[PDB]
Design a protein around this ligand. Structure first.
Ligand SMILES: [Mg+2]
Ligand SMILES: [Mg+2]
Ligand SMILES: [Mg+2]
Ligand SMILES: [Mg+2]
Ligand SMILES: [Mg+2]
Ligand SMILES: [Mg+2]
Ligand SMILES: [Mg+2]
Ligand SMILES: [Mg+2]
Ligand SMILES: [Mg+2]
Ligand SMILES: [Mg+2]
Ligand SMILES: [Mg+2]
Ligand SMILES: [Mg+2]
Ligand SMILES: [Mg+2]
Ligand SMILES: [Mg+2]
Ligand SMILES: [Mg+2]
Ligand SMILES: [Mg+2]
Ligand SMILES: [Mg+2]
Ligand SMILES: [Mg+2]
Ligand SMILES: [Mg+2]
Ligand SMILES: [Mg+2]
Ligand SMILES: [Mg+2]
Ligand SMILES: [Mg+2]
Ligand SMILES: [Mg+2]
Ligand SMILES: [Mg+2]
Ligand SMILES: [Mg+2]
Ligand SMILES: [Mg+2]
Ligand SMILES: [Mg+2]
Ligand SMILES: [Mg+2]
Ligand SMILES: [Mg+2]
Ligand SMILES: [Mg+2]
Ligand SMILES: [Mg+2]
Ligand SMILES: [Mg+2]
Ligand SMILES: [Mg+2]
Ligand SMILES: [Mg+2]
Ligand SMILES: [Mg+2]
Ligand SMILES: [Mg+2]
Ligand SMILES: [Mg+2]
Ligand SMILES: [Mg+2]
Ligand SMILES: [Mg+2]
Ligand SMILES: [Mg+2]
Ligand SMILES: [Mg+2]
Ligand SMILES: [Mg+2]
Ligand SMILES: [Mg+2]
Ligand SMILES: [Mg+2]
Ligand SMILES: [Mg+2]
Ligand SMILES: [Mg+2]
Ligand SMILES: [Mg+2]
Ligand SMILES: [Mg+2]
Ligand SMILES: [Mg+2]
Ligand SMILES: [Mg+2]
Ligand SMILES: [Mg+2]
Ligand SMILES: [Mg+2]
Ligand SMILES: [Mg+2]
Ligand SMILES: [Mg+2]
Ligand SMILES: [Mg+2]
Ligand SMILES: [Mg+2]
Ligand SMILES: [Mg+2]
Lengths: 259, 158, 134
RNA sequence: CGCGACCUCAGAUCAGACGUGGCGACCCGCUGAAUUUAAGCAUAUUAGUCAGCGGAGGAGAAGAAACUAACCAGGAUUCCCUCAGUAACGGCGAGUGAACAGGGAAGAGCCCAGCGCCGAAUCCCCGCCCCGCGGCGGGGCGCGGGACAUGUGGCGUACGGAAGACCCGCUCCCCGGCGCCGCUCGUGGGGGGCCCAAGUCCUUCUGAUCGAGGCCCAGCCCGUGGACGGUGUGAGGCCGGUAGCGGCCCCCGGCGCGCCGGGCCCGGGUCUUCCCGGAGUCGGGUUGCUUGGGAAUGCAGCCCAAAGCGGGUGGUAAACUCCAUCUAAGGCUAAAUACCGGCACGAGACCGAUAGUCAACAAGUACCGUAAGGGAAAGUUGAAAAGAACUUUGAAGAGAGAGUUCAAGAGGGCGUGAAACCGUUAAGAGGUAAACGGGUGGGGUCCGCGCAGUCCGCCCGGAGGAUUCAACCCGGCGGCGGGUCCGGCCGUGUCGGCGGCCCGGCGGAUCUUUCCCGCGCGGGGGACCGUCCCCCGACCGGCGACCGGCCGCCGCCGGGCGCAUUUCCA
RNA sequence: ACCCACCCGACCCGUCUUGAAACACGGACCAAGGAGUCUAACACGUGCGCGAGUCGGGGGCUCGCACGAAAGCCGCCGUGGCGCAAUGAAGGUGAAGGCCGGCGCGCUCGCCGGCCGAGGUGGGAUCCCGAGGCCUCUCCAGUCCGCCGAGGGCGCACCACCGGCCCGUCUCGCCCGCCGCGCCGGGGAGGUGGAGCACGAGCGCACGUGUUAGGACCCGAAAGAUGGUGAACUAUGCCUGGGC
RNA sequence: CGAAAGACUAAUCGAACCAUCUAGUAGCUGGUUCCCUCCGAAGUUUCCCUCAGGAUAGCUGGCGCUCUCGCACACGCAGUUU
RNA sequence: CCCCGGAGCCCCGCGGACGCUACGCCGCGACGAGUAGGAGGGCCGCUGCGGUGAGCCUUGAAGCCUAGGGCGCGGGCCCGGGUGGAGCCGCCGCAGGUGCAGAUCUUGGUGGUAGUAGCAAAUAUUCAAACGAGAACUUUGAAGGCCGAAGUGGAGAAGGGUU
RNA sequence: CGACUCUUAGCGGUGGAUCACUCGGCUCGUGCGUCGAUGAAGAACGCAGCUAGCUGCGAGAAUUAAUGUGAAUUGCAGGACACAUUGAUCAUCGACACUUCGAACGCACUUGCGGCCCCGGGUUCCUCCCGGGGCUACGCCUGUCUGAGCGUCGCU
């Protein structure tokens, strides 16, 4: 809000003794705006309490490994059909979930090709659902150039644009990434972890060179490896009804002694 | 009033500081502008290194830095004299020259002569006209590179 | 999307641009499609509508297959008046009801020299793009 | 008593030039508070800050060491990060508070006076010609004026310079024009103009659609275009645009080639002989301000007032002494840097008409004040004005009918139309002001019923009626699970191959310069170690990591089974 | 839940106050507006990443930014910050001890070889060992599985105590060292000051609370300062007119 | 400016008016916006140009941690008494 | 002295809820005043952003109103009907100029007071007519009155600015 | 029942909250970075067929020319134009024009007084008179012309 906002008046308080109320009141004149109420956050005209400043700490800076950890986490759950389906993406009829494709797809220079591809791969019904979501936004962002809203679609990770990013462009829903420049804002939109992507074999090879396997450095991010796991056996149902453990448990007291 | 334990601390917000707050919303826009301007300057100085001129090796001052070595401002006159480059010309071939540098020890001097010698070896002086007189190199070492050198020219590695 | 960083995509800016548009610019805004018949013949989608073209109204109340001659072009009001597109006021007097040019189709153009040269320029650019696409 | 030089001064509506005011976001020079903090206050602080005056530019200022340092030393200025809330200052309280180094952004360096040499070799203005002329210039020609020796120009300035002799190697740089060629990064520089994809297809809602299903061919078309706006609701395809190393036309810039006109005989090293520095300034004393600068950081006034192996600095006063380091008292200089004013654009997790600027509107308007100055309120009929013809009552405003509109339960301050408050209509009550909490009753308003609500669901027994089964085999498909791990793919731990090791790469302060290349160092090999991969065998976790057969079980389809069965229905 | 009736109950809220129904203030009524914010610095708590490190800025390389003024990467990855060491005003100094054997006279002092290597007491969650049961449809043999377990151990963290080491300081003492034998340098014993060491816990990011500096929860002075406008009223002087 | 009343100086005078410094400062008045749940004070200490305020103890809450054993197998602690 | 793909089960160690959003579900005891103040939970509420609901919406969004039906301890919420006429919400995250009865609060509006106070300075009006929808007030005529030439008369100055 | 009063609801008023819109703001960024004696900013007064305000312009006055565009402008009139023609209307803007105050310039601020050169009527240069035109600020520099001085000399 502007600096001068509210203070461009010259207004003194009629002190006590005049009845009225000790506010600074507009000085002199034969207008409506005379002996009014200036400056106070409560007055009409007035001046907002704690006017907003530009030097509010807008930007927010995050540790680099943590950023990478998130981006690994999103990738890891771009596998897992459950996490992709739960994130909404109609991935029912898709052939294999870390969906990787031939690298002619770098070639394509026309939406025609890019859509045909998506229909063969059965990824179109996500795009279809994007069209279905296209609707008007609720409220004031309508009058501030955020008027329409819709779904996020299939990600498409490419290794090099040989034409591709032109091809997939008008197809609403699609975002294109380079592998070498991935982004958590796009791999986990809403801060929500799953997301159906579509890999290019050239790009899908490059992932291990970028992120490093568990027994090999990144070899592309100088000093980095994957984050180690805290617990390895995630399925505790496989643990808890093992021989080794159930051997060593007292028998479950389960009678219900009511009052 | 202070309450039970804490640094008895002095902030410097008693002048009208909000009148002189300097935001950094530029900086991205700035960073680009420099970068464009940088790429333009390269393109203007066509086969010449983007870097600038070549600069001497030089030790830092003080006990602290002492052990490290930087690029200096420009090669001394003795170093040009010994290498055998006329000081007025050295500017015209991309050799930084300061003339305010003393030269105390002969270990720093011979190193910096060696630098200029090496430079003169791996330099490709184009002739003034396309018709080729003396000094100007062969059209072989010219066609094979009218290439710019990315980064600092012959970088110093401590 | 639009990528040109000197265009606007800003409701307030586009509307202000529109409503406070100058006559010669409004001419372009007030354009209207050719009939499929002419679309075939001239190789042109649409044309800036003019004082005495022949025209169908395509949508609204006056939507109909009659071919009325244009009567005038009220560029201030973003509208054109058409021959029998009219309504009786309280006291019997006919009043030319406005139709917006874009909800109308030109069946017959009023061809002058300049209109002829315009159509020649638009058709040529269309065929350049088809040659570039091929 | 003249005439003539010059000197110092006047006057011209003398000829020709410039300066004056504005703006002021940023910038330079002065000037300079007090609220305030210190829980009082006077030093301090607020603050070299507001107000005041001056002067600028697209930036300004600064800037090519009288610098840092004390190192094995750095090397103009500006800017950022850091130094650092540190050294220091301070009623050592409140509080205040730099610099060097280091890493970056940028990067560019120069010229006089003097000292000297050169016939003033220089400059300005006249006037005549040729070119050029919307940033008054080139070339030539004039016994045409003047400036200038009280010093103009070339060489030259501390990084040394000049003049000499011989060592060497050889000779393009600039401008005034006139042309002409390649339109020269947002991927054709800048500006202007004019252009360029695809449905108003079906049906159906609607006052109007832009909405909803649909559109065999793989999916209506186009899609480098599904930004945005407009158009009687919500529009990739109606229109303007949007995309595109898309088009055409203008103009202008910038750089490439040719010709002419001029200028321009412009080096380097080596040895010798010469040459060399800014005074009422430095410095001191002082008083006042200023600084973190403290026995004086910087600026001032006044007084004193210099030197030349001098002078200045070397963060505690002085003397002696060595070292180090610059060279002051003359000047110019792009760049990274700043920008709440201007012109022109772009955007927003902002505001949405008591908000957001004072100001969405005929706002710095109306209005007030002698004046300096103060300073509002105020957006919205409808898709379209189709803004109510006509009849009638009234002097008229106002009505009553009629009409327009999807609607006037939208009628020109008209979208929606809350509350306070008022009018009426209906219902109920009424001498302790009203109103309230708890508890019942009565009446109303609607709401759910029921014209039996006897509510359903299993299973069973009987009684009626109707289709094909189930049970079973047979053929097919699919699924599960299993062990023989049977056969093969798959991968964990271990051992064997030293096998990838050079046909496996990186890393290493491990080594070797027996190596190679480039100049004791750099790069590359070559050993070595660490790490990552092939070959087969063996043991073991046989792991949701899979295949193939076999087994068992399940399910579906079709075959079989026609009826004491298996269904449906009452 | 609308109205009415009746019995019982029942003073008007806000606020300052020991005390408010108060003869204490504010309040006729309704609508909209309206006050603990943001920045910086500190501290503690909590969450995440990495961990004797950590770090990201600032800068740079990748784009015309549609989304991007993002995202990514950097021998800059670390100049540098904080951290990994203190203590002294400073010159400076700077965290090890034990044991064993030998040689100097073991002199609770000086020098040479070997071994262990962050001391010890008490309490300590927890682990570990475990006599012994306690049965099995018989009399004994007898491996397997538990359940308990008297008794005994290693003892985390943490606490209390005693030792030890480093810096400052004092007191007392006796020896070593060498290019410079000196107003040189080095050690020992015993106290005592230190925001110390005694097998590390930090760094960055985020949220919360608190405390400050800022307009700093919102409203409120009397005043103070700078620069400007007024003698059309009125005060006094003067000029020129009028009136009694 | 005053034949003096601190009179008058544009309804303003024991220091005019206008704009700014200025959102001047306030240990003092006033106000300070939704629900449920759980815990729940103090007006006493010492210091203060302190007495209508701070500081510091105290009294409150929150976060915990370390242990204890009703899992036939307990140590320590108290607004008592012996 | 035999096997649960069958002991038939009050216990079943072969496999295991109707139950198991393990931030879930269930059982036993105990307890419950509260200013200032503190903390927790709010499927309480407001506005905007990333996600997400193949959400809703001209076959009627928001708002508004309702002696209609309900839920919740409560903040609040949901449905019916009316009105309205174009947008709007649920969930998971993030963000804040986020919730009013008070401030002699600010801006706007409205009451009671109230058809009340009040329309009393300076002696004065009456008759007829005209116009006119309409006359206490205009105009004309007639009468009765006042200002009483230091004027309620006739002309300027200043000031107004078309009166 | 009566009037009045209170309560609730219906409908109507008053009033303009709410909601929905937004050619306006606020903030951040980019590029450029240009006023003036050749008369600036600012002020004044003018100018439309009917026009008061806002805007736009300057006695050529809601504009002239030019170039681009290519049929309007429109509240009503009137008109033009041949929109197969420099051609309506917009845009651009390079030519032209630009009343009075204002640094503000003949001197004054009445809008008053002038001087000096030339031109037309007036004369027949007769000066008057009238009208038109061009000059007439201060400071300062380079030159130019006229000079001043018991300033310093020389010759006579
Ligand atoms: Mg405001
Ligand atoms: Mg809303
Ligand atoms: Mg550089
Ligand atoms: Mg000026
Ligand atoms: Mg004070
Ligand atoms: Mg105080
Ligand atoms: Mg005081
Ligand atoms: Mg100061
Ligand atoms: Mg100032
Ligand atoms: Mg400058
Ligand atoms: Mg200098
Ligand atoms: Mg420096
Ligand atoms: Mg620090
Ligand atoms: Mg200071
Ligand atoms: Mg000279
Ligand atoms: Mg559209
Ligand atoms: Mg639309
Ligand atoms: Mg189109
Ligand atoms: Mg000072
Ligand atoms: Mg000293
Ligand atoms: Mg300078
Ligand atoms: Mg308004
Ligand atoms: Mg309003
Ligand atoms: Mg407003
Ligand atoms: Mg409104
Ligand atoms: Mg309205
Ligand atoms: Mg409204
Ligand atoms: Mg309606
Ligand atoms: Mg309506
Ligand atoms: Mg209305
Ligand atoms: Mg409306
Ligand atoms: Mg009644
Ligand atoms: Mg009190
Ligand atoms: Mg009392
Ligand atoms: Mg009370
Ligand atoms: Mg009383
Ligand atoms: Mg009081
Ligand atoms: Mg009251
Ligand atoms: Mg409110
Ligand atoms: Mg912490
Ligand atoms: Mg604290
Ligand atoms: Mg605060
Ligand atoms: Mg105040
Ligand atoms: Mg004072
Ligand atoms: Mg005073
Ligand atoms: Mg305040
Ligand atoms: Mg007090
Ligand atoms: Mg508690
Ligand atoms: Mg309680
Ligand atoms: Mg409370
Ligand atoms: Mg509408
Ligand atoms: Mg906000
Ligand atoms: Mg209220
Ligand atoms: Mg009365
Ligand atoms: Mg008269
Ligand atoms: Mg009513
Ligand atoms: Mg209003």
């Amino acid at each position: 809000v502007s600096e001068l906002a509210g203070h461009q008046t010259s207004a003194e308080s009629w002190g006590t003794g005049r009845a009225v109320a000790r506010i600074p009141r507009v000085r002199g004149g034969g207008t409506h705006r005379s002996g009014q109420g200036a400056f106070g956050n409560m007055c009409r005209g007035g001046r907002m309490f704690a006017p907003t400043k530009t030097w509010r700490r807008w930007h927010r800076r995050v540790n680099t490994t943590q950023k990478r950890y998130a981006i690994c986490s999103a990738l890891a759950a771009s596998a897992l059909p459950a996490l992709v389906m739960s994130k909404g993406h109609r991935i029912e009829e898709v052939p294999e979930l870390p969906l990787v494709v031939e690298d002619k797809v770098e070639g394509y220079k026309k939406t025609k090709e890019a859509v045909l591809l998506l229909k063969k791969l059965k990824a179109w019904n996500d795009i279809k659902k994007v069209y279905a979501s296209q609707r008007m936004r609720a409220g004031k962002g309508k009058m501030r150039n955020r008027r329409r809203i819709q779904r996020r679609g299939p990600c498409v990770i490419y290794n090099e644009d040989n034409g591709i990013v032109k091809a997939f462009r008008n197809i609403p829903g699609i975002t294109l990434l380079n592998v070498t420049k991935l982004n958590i804002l796009k791999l986990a939109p809403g801060g929500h972890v799953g997301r159906f992507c579509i890999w290019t074999e050239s790009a899908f090879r490059k992932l291990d060179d970028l992120y490093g396997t568990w027994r090999k450095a990144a070899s592309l991010k100088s000093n980095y490896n994957l984050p180690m796991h805290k617990m390895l056996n995630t399925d505790l149902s496989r643990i808890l009804k093992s021989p080794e453990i159930q051997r060593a448990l007292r028998a479950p007291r389960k009678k219900i002694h009511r009052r | 009033a202070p309450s039970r334990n804490g640094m008895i601390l002095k902030p410097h917000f008693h002048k009208d500081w909000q009148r002189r707050v300097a935001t950094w919303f530029n900086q991205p826009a700035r960073k680009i502008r420099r970068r464009k301007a940088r790429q333009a300057r390269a393109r203007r100085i066509a086969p010449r290194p983007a870097s600038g001129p070549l600069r001497p090796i030089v030790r830092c001052p003080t006990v602290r830095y002492h052990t490290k070595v930087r690029a200096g401002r420009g090669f001394s006159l003795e170093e040009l004299r010994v290498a055998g480059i006329h000081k007025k010309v050295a500017r015209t071939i991309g050799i930084s020259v300061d003339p305010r540098r003393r030269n105390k020890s002969t270990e720093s001097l011979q190193a910096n002569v060696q630098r200029l010698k090496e430079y003169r070896s791996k330099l490709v002086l184009f002739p003034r006209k396309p018709s080729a007189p003396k000094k100007g190199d062969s059209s072989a070492e010219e066609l094979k590179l009218a290439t710019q050198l990315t980064g600092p020219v012959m970088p110093i590695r401590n | 999307m639009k990528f040109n960083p000197f265009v606007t995509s800003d409701r307030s800016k586009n509307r202000k641009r529109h409503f406070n548009a100058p006559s010669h610019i409004r001419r372009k805004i007030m354009s209207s499609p050719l009939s499929k018949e002419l679309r075939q013949k001239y190789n042109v989608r649409s044309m800036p509508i003019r004082k005495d073209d022949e025209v169908q109204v395509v949508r609204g109340h006056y939507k109909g297959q009659q071919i009325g001659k244009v009567v005038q072009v009220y560029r201030k009001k973003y509208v054109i008046y058409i021959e029998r597109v009219q309504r009786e006021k309280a006291n019997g007097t006919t009043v030319h009801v406005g139709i917006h040019p874009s909800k109308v189709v030109i069946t017959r153009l009023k061809l002058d020299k300049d209109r002829k040269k315009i159509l020649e320029r638009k058709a040529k650019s269309r065929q350049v793009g088809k040659e570039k696409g091929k």
